[PDB]
Design an enzyme around this catalytic site. Structure first.
Site, PDB file in Angstrom:
ATOM      1  N   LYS A  15       0.822  -1.204   0.000  1.00  0.00           N
ATOM      2  CA  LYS A  15       0.000   0.000   0.000  1.00  0.00           C
ATOM      3  C   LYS A  15       0.856   1.252   0.000  1.00  0.00           C
ATOM      4  CE  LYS A  15      -3.831  -1.949   2.658  1.00  0.00           C
ATOM      5  NZ  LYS A  15      -4.833  -1.605   1.613  1.00  0.00           N
ATOM      6  N   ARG A  71     -10.466 -11.188   1.322  1.00  0.00           N
ATOM      7  CA  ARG A  71     -11.310 -12.195   0.705  1.00  0.00           C
ATOM      8  C   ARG A  71     -10.624 -13.556   0.752  1.00  0.00           C
ATOM      9  NH1 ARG A  71     -11.634  -8.919  -4.752  1.00  0.00           N
ATOM     10  NH2 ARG A  71     -11.138  -7.302  -3.195  1.00  0.00           N
TER      11      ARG A  71
HETATM   12  C1  LIG Z   1      -9.543  -2.075   1.086  1.00  0.00           C
HETATM   13  C2  LIG Z   1      -8.968  -3.277   0.301  1.00  0.00           C
HETATM   14  C3  LIG Z   1      -8.683  -4.435   1.266  1.00  0.00           C
HETATM   15  S1  LIG Z   1      -7.265  -4.232   2.331  1.00  0.00           S
HETATM   16  C4  LIG Z   1      -7.754  -2.888  -0.556  1.00  0.00           C
HETATM   17  O1  LIG Z   1      -6.921  -2.091  -0.108  1.00  0.00           O
HETATM   18  N1  LIG Z   1      -7.640  -3.428  -1.798  1.00  0.00           N
HETATM   19  C5  LIG Z   1      -8.319  -4.612  -2.373  1.00  0.00           C
HETATM   20  C6  LIG Z   1      -7.835  -4.615  -3.799  1.00  0.00           C
HETATM   21  S2  LIG Z   1      -8.825  -3.508  -4.857  1.00  0.00           S
HETATM   22  C7  LIG Z   1      -7.918  -3.616  -6.425  1.00  0.00           C
HETATM   23  C8  LIG Z   1      -7.058  -2.576  -6.832  1.00  0.00           C
HETATM   24  C9  LIG Z   1      -6.333  -2.660  -8.053  1.00  0.00           C
HETATM   25  C10 LIG Z   1      -6.477  -3.803  -8.877  1.00  0.00           C
HETATM   26  C11 LIG Z   1      -7.344  -4.851  -8.475  1.00  0.00           C
HETATM   27  C12 LIG Z   1      -8.057  -4.748  -7.247  1.00  0.00           C
HETATM   28  C13 LIG Z   1      -6.369  -4.260  -3.583  1.00  0.00           C
HETATM   29  C14 LIG Z   1      -6.442  -3.098  -2.587  1.00  0.00           C
HETATM   30  C15 LIG Z   1      -6.482  -1.706  -3.249  1.00  0.00           C
HETATM   31  O2  LIG Z   1      -7.493  -1.006  -3.116  1.00  0.00           O
HETATM   32  O3  LIG Z   1      -5.509  -1.313  -3.899  1.00  0.00           O
HETATM   33 ZN   LIG Z   2      -5.420  -5.436   1.746  1.00  0.00          ZN
END
Ligand SMILES: C[C@H](CS)C(=O)N1C[C@@H](Sc2ccccc2)C[C@H]1C(=O)O
Ligand SMILES: [Zn+2]
Ligand SMILES: C[C@H](CS)C(=O)N1C[C@@H](Sc2ccccc2)C[C@H]1C(=O)O
Ligand SMILES: C[C@H](CS)C(=O)N1C[C@@H](Sc2ccccc2)C[C@H]1C(=O)O
Ligand code: NA
Ligand code: NA
Ligand SMILES: [Zn+2]
Ligand SMILES: [Zn+2]
Ligand SMILES: [Zn+2]
Ligand SMILES: [Zn+2]
Ligand SMILES: [Zn+2]
EC number: 3.4.11.1
Lengths: 486, 486, 243
Positions: free
Chosen positions: A262, A336
């Site tokens: 992140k 997930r």
């Molecule tokens: C709040 C959630 C759970 S921690 C999270 O941070 N996600 C889930 C996926 S969405 C995502 C972003 C780019 C490509 C594919 C999916 C990854 C991350 C994000 O947003 O970059």
């Molecule tokens: Zn995550």
């Protein structure tokens, strides 16, 4: 020093002056009309959520804070999907209590405001602050019901609010303290203090491996922090064989995103990526305190998502408990992954319903923000029950679609049965929900994406800035009504 | 309804109770000790900047707000570079007045708090809000001195604060309203209302072209909004031939960055990219109102920086009034371009000093934020005068280096005499200042980069969120002292 | 009459708050709101539905130039309300504010606007369904029922004061054209529109997510989808028969 919070409603056209609640009018009578007199002198009328403080009205109450309750007959608002009166009370009382606290008064008596539970929730939720790690803290305020006629309702409010505050504490606490193990131990002590009709199993990694939860394990391995699968049982049903309701919560104690790391900005908030586990566990603790006549099982896979020499690698294929393979294209879509295994396990209890909660997608935040928790469910009955409960609590839910349209985008997978991220970047909360559905065969399953309501700035008046612990009360209300109705 | 703001100091160890100001003690005496009595009953003592409201103490003052003034003898704070007592007063009074306004009281009498000017500044700066374009506005509060013994000091405070508020208004006003022409007309009417010993020339494009201000013109041409070169004269010196002090201000009414376009996030704040012009023009208006015995000339090149089919193109070389060529590598470094021509023009007045102000660099914000205005000057005498004035006003300045080290980075130019951006991204405010210095030969020149103090969130207690109009008062104080000393 | 309003930005570059280059060509469909409501009315006419219908479509381009909207500018809507244009790329709600105001002059039975209003809507539901914001459950239900028949689905989205608060918290004017927070973009955009609506039966359809089709809807080749035109037609048909 003892403070007093009294409510006053907005003046109706037929009234000559705004009306005090019963407690307000009684106090005014007690001070020979000085309360009304000073309020009149103070200026403009008090509107909903506004407060004004009057000093020296009574020797026992050097500080009296009158709070605006809005329209006395404010009921269910068809446009806002909540009981407006209860929301007015929660906000007004919270505001009043914060004023008493700022005056550094350690004790406050609170006007039931025609709805002791709402008043209690406003005071308890409103005063809450996670300041265990601070040298400088506000005065600890003990809020109690003003009068002795609405005790059960008041205590019900305290209970509901305390449940939410437990979730808030768990979410707010820094991850180096709130580890999977610590979270499990805190939930355990709280549940056991709530009732002895409970069993808590802090399942170690060996058990998780035995349960073939390869998806959950894949997420946890990147970190040195031991993962645990929290399993809690509340045996409230008169019939021990009565199928239980099963709650599942995403328990990522800290999410760095892993290899799909992140951005640095506000990543500290990811210490609340275990909010799903926090809310469902807290709701169960509260259900136990309410001694609801139902069997409930709580499942919370807990671990950190960290980058390291053994962390999940994009493209890796892991096998869920149900044998389904998952292509981990993005290691930051780890919630997930752990939920896949927890949801699979949830079916072994032959539950009446399965409800999972998770701070699952930023997409949910972009979709509804903190206005409402997104609810994905294959049961309109279940949706309606959650919705109705939310009207009462004010901690709103909003239904989101479980369409094959989204499923198609996650099962279109290069290497495995399902990809942990959709092929398109659109409808992130919906594809995430579709992914979860691939691990659910139950006819009454609801997935709550609480990512948008994970925090509060000022949206919910009675919640100070910080982790919100939403929608814990809505889950509690749901359970209460289910134990009575369903 | 008439409100009253009274001050109380923090209790000294030798005192038995916190002491009221003279006005506070007198009022308390007037209400037979009820003020002290209720304050005692209300709880903990009032600390610096804190307030507490007492109702019905006197028929003429239904609302009395006591404000904490901190330590009575608080003087110059060697670590903060300001008179702490004055800052305490400004903050406390501002807080008190905001409380009176929230009670919707249209009139308030303000305790001089031992320093009527500081009290006035707190009230006037504190109550200010640019709400001309809003349907819903707070009640307009008329603040007046409580008592009649500190009138000149109080009015001096109102004058200083009004000067800053004029700058704030000019800066806050949306650019489609606050165009170069409108800005010039508002400054003109304000200066002329301040004194008839003035001349205002709203120089049109034809004049600018006649003056060979190719650098300024290059910036303006991208927009359809006509540019103007505001020239204001305040003839306060008894001797008409007395060399004037010249102030120059960057007047970009709106900066989109031009072809080197800015990011969308918070670009709306660039409506205040004319803050340099706003502060120096407002300071001159105030100098005129103070009838300072000095000649002052204000110069403000005003235009928008917009992208279009005729806008400045990166790499373009423009010729400043002094014949120096400038390579415009980044069209968003337009402030130094228009200032090059204005600074050149400033020398034609054979000024005693040349002081320019400009919301010049984000680097300045990254350097000192809103803590202080960065001052680049080739005269320690001038620096010291500005510094000393800032101690009094509390609107701090901090010296920044005018080293050849930075000059070298802007004169290292591929196509021209000087590049409008340094070859390195480091020390952005310093290289910008070095660029300006290439258009200055005067021995007493000071460049104030006010980009960091362009806005206020909550840093300066007595300024509500919005454009700050800083450091207008420091410039006024500087002028006042110069008219007396230098 | 029933009044339909559609966002008709023939091309949106974002203006001074310029868009990124990637796929900006798709913004030629930023007039999809106007396209769908106008097409639905054309079809209603072909069906000779026994109802009066008015279609309103403010049409223009959103381009950067020496006279373009500047972030921070305050403009006055037809109803006298001032708007702080913090982001010139949130232009659809700006033109709709005036069109929605005008819609009330027809004393309509209902007011339904459509617009490729927010990327947030796409992030919310993608092309699965058109987001419907409405202050009338009756209207929502009618649109929903019609969508079941057409298959061009709609999904209700919240019109909560929660979102309104985030757009009326404005530094310079009555309402800001972008929320103070980046969350719930479609909801705050809808809240902004609601500030220009006093009608008891208003529905706002954010069709940004269904603006295009890749392969989601099997019977639509890759390209602009023209959704949810049929759902609007079905709605009108049933209204002419039922309501
Ligand atoms: C709040 C959630 C759970 S921690 C999270 O941070 N996600 C889930 C996926 S969405 C995502 C972003 C780019 C490509 C594919 C999916 C990854 C991350 C994000 O947003 O970059
Ligand atoms: Zn995550
Ligand atoms: C506050 C100032 C004046 S408007 C401003 O925005 N600058 C000035 C230059 S700095 C700069 C940035 C990159 C390379 C070279 C110089 C351009 C612009 C900016 O920061 O990108
Ligand atoms: C689809 C819409 C309409 S054209 C659009 O592109 N928006 C609307 C706003 S959202 C927005 C983005 C950042 C801050 C505030 C609001 C601007 C633009 C965008 O997403 O950057
Ligand atoms: Na935590
Ligand atoms: Na301005
Ligand atoms: Zn996560
Ligand atoms: Zn610039
Ligand atoms: Zn600039
Ligand atoms: Zn746009
Ligand atoms: Zn658009």
């Amino acid at each position: 020093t003892k403070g007093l919070v009294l409510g006053i409603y907005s003046k109706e056209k037929e009234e000559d002056e705004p009306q005090f609640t019963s407690a307000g009018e009684n106090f005014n009578k007690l001070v020979s009309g000085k309360l009304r007199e000073i309020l009149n002198i103070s200026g403009p009328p008090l509107k909903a959520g506004k407060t004004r403080t009057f000093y020296g009205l009574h020797e026992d109450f050097p500080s009296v804070v009158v709070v605006g309750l809005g329209k006395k007959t404010a009921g269910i608002d068809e446009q806002e999907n909540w009981h407006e009166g209860k929301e007015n009370i929660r906000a007004a009382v919270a505001a009043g209590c914060r004023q008493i606290q700022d005056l550094e008064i350690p004790s406050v008596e609170v006007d039931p405001c025609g709805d002791a539970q709402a008043a209690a929730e406003g005071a308890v939720l409103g005063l809450y602050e996670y300041d265990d790690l601070k040298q400088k803290r506000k005065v600890v305020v003990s809020a109690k019901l003003h009068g002795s006629e609405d005790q059960e309702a008041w205590q019900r409010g305290v209970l509901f609010a305390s449940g939410q505050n437990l979730a808030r504490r768990l979410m707010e606490t820094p991850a180096n303290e709130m580890t999977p193990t610590k979270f499990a131990e805190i939930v355990e002590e709280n549940l056991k203090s709530a009732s002895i009709k409970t069993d808590v199993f802090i399942r170690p990694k060996s058990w998780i491996e035995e349960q073939e939860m390869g998806s959950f394990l894949s997420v946890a391995k990147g970190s040195e922090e031991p993962p645990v699968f929290l399993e809690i049982h509340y045996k409230g049903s008169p019939n021990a064989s009565e199928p239980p309701l099963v709650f599942v919560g995403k328990g990522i104690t800290f999410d760095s995103g892993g290899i799909s790391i992140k951005a640095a900005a506000n990543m500290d908030l990811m210490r609340a990526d275990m909010g799903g586990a926090a809310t469902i566990c807290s709701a169960i603790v509260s259900a136990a305190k309410l001694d609801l006549p139902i069997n409930i099982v709580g499942l919370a896979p807990l671990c950190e998502n960290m980058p390291s020499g053994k962390a999940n690698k994009p493209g890796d294929v892991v096998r869920a408990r149900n044998g389904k393979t998952i292509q981990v294209d993005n290691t930051d879509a780890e919630g997930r992954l752990i939920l896949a295994d927890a949801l699979c396990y949830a079916h072994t209890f032959n539950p009446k319903v399965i409800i999972n909660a998770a701070t699952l997608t930023g997409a949910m935040d972009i979709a509804l923000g903190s206005g409402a928790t997104g609810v994905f469910t294959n049961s309109s009955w279940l949706w309606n029950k959650l919705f109705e409960a939310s009207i009462e609590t004010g901690d709103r839910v909003w239904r989101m679609p479980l369409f094959e349209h989204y499923t198609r985008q996650v099962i279109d997978c290069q290497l495995a049965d399902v990809n942990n991220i959709g092929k398109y970047r659109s409808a992130g909360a919906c594809t995430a929900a579709a992914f979860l559905k691939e691990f659910v065969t139950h006819p009454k399953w609801a997935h709550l994406d609480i990512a948008g309501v994970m925090t509060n700035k000022d949206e919910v008046p009675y919640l100070r800035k910080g982790m919100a612990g939403r929608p814990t009360r809505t889950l509690i209300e749901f359970l209460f009504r289910f134990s009575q109705d369903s």
